[PDB]
Symmetry: C4
């Protein structure tokens, strides 16, 4: 069954039938950083080869017009660049000059104006293109979207009781000794709806509260946590009986985001629960122990859940019954 | 008709008559990154040429004072830099030394003090200016203000009903497979007003609510969305009849902002609706379909709107009539 | 009269008598980027000179132990680095090898083990120190704290009436065609106070509201704005008569912050008003005009204020009188 | 006694028993930047040595297949790279070509195809790996987590009275002339609890208010501050008598975060108070003085606290007594 968000973040959406493609070329940098690696390497090689070959051709041209080929042996002919005979020899001079290697078996003389003004232009353009390419490679290597590989979520969430209130709970944890600076979490409910006038919204997004009003959703993440949402008169689950649950077709998306510590960039991680990942009347299992001055986690029970007792009735009915019996 | 914000972001404002221009030189870096390209290239070329020519002149001077010109042929005269005769030859030594090419047909000897202390200063200044220029070029290539080329807004917004409440709606969508991290939206109303005391504010900015109180304006953008603002007793549209609308002269600005994914920089996108982009009694057209495991968008109907039935009366009159008839 | 914040941001506070100075060396990078320029250049020169001289000494040592000095003329003695006789000659080899120039009049041979393993170490350390220094220079050139040079505030603020409510107003404006992304503003009141128990707080900081509750302080800055604070029952000015004002000794600080557009860094700007910058019964002067399709600003009247009529009574007395007379 | 957070930030938690280690290799960059220095240097050396040795071997191979070894003396044999006899000589050519030094005693000729296509590949791969390594080193040198070395907290917090209200107070200060841009503070209470149904949460995190509702926790940090939390009907200390305090086992964590000024990265600082750092009936000591136009701080009394008079009764009892006596 389709789910519109996979269990690891990838979305099932296919952007098709766009008529304005020239936008993809107005911001070419983003497009470059977005491709795969097999294509980035190919583009680097092509750009460098073209840049070298162009200046090789112009060097050979300057040599040819002046008349250096006709005098390849005359000593009384101080030429332009020394030891430059054919095409393949003039091709090597460009490589040795632009990449700054400069062996020195073929070197430039000082009786050849417009040679210096070609050399300046070559150095400047070399520097520019070099900067562009190395910057692209570095940015593609050090992006933050990778940290989300070690921010484990949990499988199926649970619904249970907490001192007279129904709640919906799930669990989240990290895996490295580093820190996520300024972490925060939110959750959305996705389900189709139809207004009373006739409109039909395919995928309506509603927001559910996990502590936005009291500032309790800026969490401090060291040990595995348990996020919980209370079912009051504003929660979309305000009346969902136990037997009523498996019939509905809804989905919960969960988003956690914060800054990486070493650099200062922002990362985001996502997940989803559909209808078969919501168990009624369960609890998680503790994972913390104390040993000689260190708390010890066990990511062995991180997904494990056990069963307990819980009423089977909607929150609305529970509240109505409690208020009727506490005043009768 | 002037509009104070064009349909793509550019503003119609002309900063004139400034008497303190030296500020533009206290933060020269911003000014450099702000210019066009035709001028950036010219400035790069000029800076590099001056830097090379200065040290060329000082090299020739050192050579001249010591007395190397008078002895261009004497073998018993170990000079300073070898094979350095005229101005144009001493100009090439600076280029080959600063850019680190170093052919080696003209090389420095070891009987010439103050040559080494010139060489150190040259290397250090070369490194500094090189860093400055390449940094400027890279920053100008990789700025985030470009991503806003693929964050399409919609043309004319609409006003219609939603289960007994008037609302004002518009639509927003993306075009790439990437993600905007931590997106958010806001909107402002611009219209001239005059207080009861006599003051006259030319362009008064008021804020309209799109979900700031319930944290519902931190949106999760994958598929094209429909942002809506409800017209309650606090909205500036609290009494605007249908026939009354075309007479007013107001404007709505819309701002969306968030972080690019690959890098970690912030981008912003804007738009506007004046008075002829607000239709009364219309709806948008759905664009989502389901195909074998993928949802399919069609940016073919993205701007398309159709017509439906809607009362023609201000929100205040609707509420008054409903409350009078639901209690009579 | 001291003011604890100057009219351009600098603060009058002198951190003295610190006993733990080794902290300033645990984060040496911040300390480097914080110094002046006259000292940064000196440190660059010193570091580079020491790095070159050390390896020069070790090269000469390797040459000496092996016995190359005793045979400066023997042809049947393939030595280590060719044409290396004295100290000053071995000093140049280090410069030419580390900075990658490599003339080639003194070149390394292939009969000299531990020469290659010295060359590797030299290349690696050169690369590291080069990276460190160029990074420091670039960061010091491109910091954002400079943009605040073109974010003009206004001189003396004013107090006047707005449709039956006292308000306190000041003005803020920009000077460039760029944009501040995600701007925001806040203000604090600084004044000494003494509790009823006996404590004495020298500089107590209180916050004043400029629109935090309604999200109206996220401003959209193109044309010069007028920020205003309303004097209700919670404002520290809840009873300040006209004649009572010049006797008090308080201060208002104003802070505006947001992101630069080209890069993605955050900048902050500050100012202050003491007791003689608060005029009672004045208004600002408009600066906007319309010309053929462009709005025109005039930073000629940006500071100009004129005079008008206003009651001379505290807000508390105004409210009490109005409520007594509107019910008598 | 264990405390779950040390007095300087380090946490007592030991992540053990992970079964999915391949994640640590999907984002190798983070792992590199996370190691110590002794290992980073070793990895740099190993990578560079392998990269040079590989291409050295392939150069020697090309030379061998063509038949250059058999003719080490024949003049009528224009070879590939000149003066290339053995393994150790072909090893030096790779070093001189990749690092761009290029002495020129062994130089490449122009009768040797597939030499140029090896040279292109070498230059490109050299550039890539160079970029990667220098980027890693720079990022590890300039991270912001170091600034937190000069953001001193205070030792034991205090509990006292403030015009008829109990409050809990602590102090925070800086040490440099720079500025933290957009500072903010929060605090959490950590204590084990057990619900009424039977669940047992080992380390339950609750939030305590320090000014989140009124926007008073965005502080402006120049001089040492005193943060205070008021004990109303929602504070977890709503009934804690003086004699009752030493029996409980709770902990308070404190977190302060904001952006560094020179760069634009975010830093975080933490601390903790357990049960013996909470004194009942004390006050801090002022540190500000005025001298000829400068305020002078004295970080000599920064931790010093003195004693005063205070009732010994829970806040609930104080309120009940006051309300009963103010209405009897
Ligand atoms: C080391 O490069 C491997 C390369 C082959 O990689 P390949 O051609 O299969 O392309 C990569 C592959 O598709 C990954 O799955 C992508 O990561 P993700 O699955 O989309 O997350 C990655 O994109 P991102 O990693 O840049 O996002 C792609 O570049 O080697 C040649
Ligand atoms: C590749 O360079 C093109 C250059 C000519 O470009 P040109 O001289 O017309 O100057 C550019 C042109 O004005 C664009 O319109 C600007 O972008 P936008 O319209 O203001 O958005 C751009 O500024 P920004 O792109 O830096 O902002 C300007 O640099 O070639 C020579
Ligand atoms: C171009 O360099 C000038 C240099 C002399 O500058 P100088 O020695 O006087 O030192 C600078 C001077 O003190 C400025 O006033 C400072 O800026 P600000 O007044 O504190 O804002 C600046 O610090 P920042 O600009 O790095 O903050 C200092 O570096 O030339 C030699
Ligand atoms: C200059 O390098 C020193 C190096 C030895 O340092 P060493 O091998 O002991 O490793 C460092 C040491 O463990 C520090 O304590 C760490 O800082 P912190 O205590 O965890 O904060 C630091 O990590 P971070 O500083 O990268 O975080 C480690 O790199 O010299 C060789
Ligand atoms: K070089
Ligand atoms: K070189
Ligand atoms: K060279
Ligand atoms: K050379
Ligand atoms: K808020
Ligand atoms: K040579
Ligand atoms: K960089
Ligand atoms: K950043
Ligand atoms: Na962690
Ligand atoms: Na997208
Ligand atoms: Na502006
Ligand atoms: Na400070």
């Amino acid at each position: 069954i389709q789910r519109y968000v996979r269990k690891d973040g990838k979305c099932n959406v296919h952007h098709g039938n766009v008529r304005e493609t020239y936008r993809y070329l107005t911001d070419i940098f983003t497009t470059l950083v977005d491709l795969k690696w097999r294509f980035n390497l190919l583009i680097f090689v092509m750009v460098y080869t073209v840049t070298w070959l162009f200046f090789g051709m112009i060097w050979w041209l300057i040599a040819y017009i002046r008349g250096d080929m006709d005098h390849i042996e005359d000593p009384s002919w101080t030429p332009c660049v020394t030891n430059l005979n054919g095409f393949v020899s003039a091709f090597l001079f460009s490589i040795e000059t632009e990449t700054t290697i400069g062996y020195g078996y073929r070197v430039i003389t000082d009786k050849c104006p417009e040679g210096i003004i070609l050399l300046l232009i070559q150095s400047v353009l070399g520097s520019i293109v070099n900067a562009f390419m190395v910057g692209c490679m570095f940015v593609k290597i050090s992006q933050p979207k990778k940290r989300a590989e070690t921010l484990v979520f949990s499988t199926h969430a649970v619904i249970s009781m907490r001192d007279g209130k129904l709640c919906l709970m799930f669990r989240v944890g990290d895996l490295r000794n580093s820190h996520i600076v300024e972490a925060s979490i939110r959750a959305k409910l996705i389900k189709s709806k139809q207004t009373s006038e006739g409109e039909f919204i395919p995928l309506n997004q509603t927001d559910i509260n996990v502590g936005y009003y009291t500032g309790d959703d800026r969490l401090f993440l060291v040990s595995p946590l348990i996020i919980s949402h209370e079912i009051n008169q504003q929660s979309p689950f305000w009346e969902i009986s136990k037997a009523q649950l498996p019939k509905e077709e809804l989905e919960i998306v969960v988003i956690l985001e914060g800054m990486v510590e070493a650099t200062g960039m922002t990362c985001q991680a996502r997940s989803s629960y559909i209808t078969s990942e919501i168990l009624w009347g369960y609890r998680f299992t503790p994972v913390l122990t104390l040993e000689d001055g260190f708390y010890e986690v066990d990511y062995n029970s991180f997904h494990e859940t056990y069963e307990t007792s819980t009423p089977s009735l909607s929150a609305k009915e529970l509240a109505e019954l409690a208020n009727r019996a506490e005043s009768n």
